[PDB]
Design an enzyme around this catalytic site. Structure first.
Site, PDB file in Angstrom:
ATOM      1  N   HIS A 158       0.150   1.910  18.635  1.00  0.00           N
ATOM      2  CA  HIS A 158       1.385   1.267  19.075  1.00  0.00           C
ATOM      3  C   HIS A 158       2.571   1.878  18.358  1.00  0.00           C
ATOM      4  O   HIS A 158       2.408   2.584  17.351  1.00  0.00           O
ATOM      5  CB  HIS A 158       1.342  -0.268  18.913  1.00  0.00           C
ATOM      6  N   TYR A 198      15.128  -3.182  11.195  1.00  0.00           N
ATOM      7  CA  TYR A 198      15.559  -2.037  11.971  1.00  0.00           C
ATOM      8  C   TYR A 198      17.051  -2.057  12.261  1.00  0.00           C
ATOM      9  O   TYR A 198      17.592  -3.068  12.705  1.00  0.00           O
ATOM     10  CB  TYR A 198      14.807  -1.971  13.307  1.00  0.00           C
ATOM     11  N   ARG A 224      17.169  -5.615  14.529  1.00  0.00           N
ATOM     12  CA  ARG A 224      15.951  -6.332  14.805  1.00  0.00           C
ATOM     13  C   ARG A 224      15.121  -6.342  13.534  1.00  0.00           C
ATOM     14  O   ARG A 224      15.002  -5.321  12.853  1.00  0.00           O
ATOM     15  CB  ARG A 224      15.189  -5.646  15.935  1.00  0.00           C
ATOM     16  N   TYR A 251       0.805  -1.227   0.000  1.00  0.00           N
ATOM     17  CA  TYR A 251       0.000   0.000   0.000  1.00  0.00           C
ATOM     18  C   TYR A 251       0.846   1.289   0.000  1.00  0.00           C
ATOM     19  O   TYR A 251       2.060   1.251   0.262  1.00  0.00           O
ATOM     20  CB  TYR A 251      -0.990  -0.012   1.177  1.00  0.00           C
ATOM     21  N   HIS A 265       1.001   4.615  15.524  1.00  0.00           N
ATOM     22  CA  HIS A 265       0.061   4.319  14.438  1.00  0.00           C
ATOM     23  C   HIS A 265      -0.896   3.197  14.804  1.00  0.00           C
ATOM     24  O   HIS A 265      -0.618   2.387  15.688  1.00  0.00           O
ATOM     25  CB  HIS A 265       0.810   3.914  13.160  1.00  0.00           C
ATOM     26  N   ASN A 322       9.868  -5.868   8.349  1.00  0.00           N
ATOM     27  CA  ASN A 322      10.468  -4.623   8.835  1.00  0.00           C
ATOM     28  C   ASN A 322      11.878  -4.926   9.331  1.00  0.00           C
ATOM     29  O   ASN A 322      12.056  -5.813  10.160  1.00  0.00           O
ATOM     30  CB  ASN A 322       9.674  -4.035  10.008  1.00  0.00           C
TER      31      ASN A 322
HETATM   32  O1  LIG Z   1       7.928  -3.909  14.755  1.00  0.00           O
HETATM   33  C1  LIG Z   1       6.916  -4.407  15.301  1.00  0.00           C
HETATM   34  O2  LIG Z   1       7.014  -5.304  16.171  1.00  0.00           O
HETATM   35  C2  LIG Z   1       5.540  -3.905  14.911  1.00  0.00           C
HETATM   36  C3  LIG Z   1       5.516  -3.539  13.428  1.00  0.00           C
HETATM   37  C4  LIG Z   1       4.532  -2.432  13.088  1.00  0.00           C
HETATM   38  O3  LIG Z   1       4.030  -1.747  13.965  1.00  0.00           O
HETATM   39  C5  LIG Z   1       4.182  -2.181  11.686  1.00  0.00           C
HETATM   40  O4  LIG Z   1       5.087  -2.163  10.825  1.00  0.00           O
HETATM   41  O5  LIG Z   1       2.984  -2.005  11.356  1.00  0.00           O
HETATM   42 MN   LIG Z   2       1.859  -1.845  13.267  1.00  0.00          MN
END
Ligand SMILES: O=C(O)CCC(=O)C(=O)O
Ligand SMILES: [Mn+2]
EC number: 1.14.11.53
Length: 213
Positions: free
Chosen positions: A187, A116, A198, A67, A125, A114
């Site tokens: 969160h 990091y 991570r 998206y 968000h 994801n």
């Molecule tokens: O990194 C996380 O544990 C949550 C991932 C998150 O919030 C997202 O990418 O929508």
């Molecule tokens: Mn999320």
């Protein structure tokens, strides 16, 4: 002061959270090797334009569905725009979740990794309600971290110094988000909760009526 309200909210958030440790050290090592492979292939330009989202603190890799920019008008790319979910995700991750009744077979049509760097983070968000069904399942990989809920503190540190709840997310752990925790609260991740590299795999089903671009 009314800190009973904070205890009420935390309880409501707890009820939308389930956690299990599913992946062993070895299993994590194998998935980590594949995650590393995705990063390498992204650096090589082997994915479609909309598969990779590079940003300063964090890189996102969209498979199956993806998206656009997200005020709250996220849109789903047309079929074929992002790369398909890699087989190793089906085999190593999704299968194990189905085998342990976390989600049913055929639910997952979207996988997002994801990645990091230390000091990486996510701003407050809600997972796009118009795009994804619930529950929202995620699996953490290279190191241990913390997921925060009630992220007003990222913006008003004087008034409220702390999240409503912080949830530890260990390497190889599965987090499942639903109800209140997925719909009624924000969160985020604090830069300070990411000391080393991570990565996380987020497995979701997109809604049938998800607005498309
Ligand atoms: O990194 C996380 O544990 C949550 C991932 C998150 O919030 C997202 O990418 O929508
Ligand atoms: Mn999320």
């Amino acid at each position: 002061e009314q800190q009973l309200q904070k205890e009420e909210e935390a309880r409501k958030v707890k009820s939308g959270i389930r956690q299990m440790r599913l992946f062993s050290q070895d299993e994590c090592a194998k998935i980590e090797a594949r995650i590393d492979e995705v990063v390498s292939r992204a650096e090589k330009g082997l994915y479609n334009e909309h598969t990779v989202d590079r940003a300063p603190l964090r890189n996102k890799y969209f498979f199956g569905e993806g998206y656009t920019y997200g005020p709250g008008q996220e849109r789903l790319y047309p079929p074929g725009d992002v790369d398909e979910i890699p087989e190793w995700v089906h085999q190593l991750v999704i299968q194990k979740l189905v085998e342990h009744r976390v989600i049913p077979e055929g639910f997952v049509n979207s996988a997002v990794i994801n990645d990091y760097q230390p000091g990486g983070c996510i701003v407050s968000h809600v997972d796009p309600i118009h795009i994804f069904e619930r529950p929202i399942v995620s699996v953490s990989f290279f190191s241990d971290s913390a997921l925060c809920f009630g992220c007003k503190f990222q913006f008003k540190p004087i008034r409220v110094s702390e999240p409503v709840l912080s949830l530890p997310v260990r390497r190889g752990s599965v987090t499942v988000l639903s109800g209140y925790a997925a719909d009624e609260i924000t969160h985020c991740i604090r830069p300070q909760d990411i000391k080393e590299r991570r990565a996380v795999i987020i497995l979701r089903k997109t809604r049938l009526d998800a607005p498309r671009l």
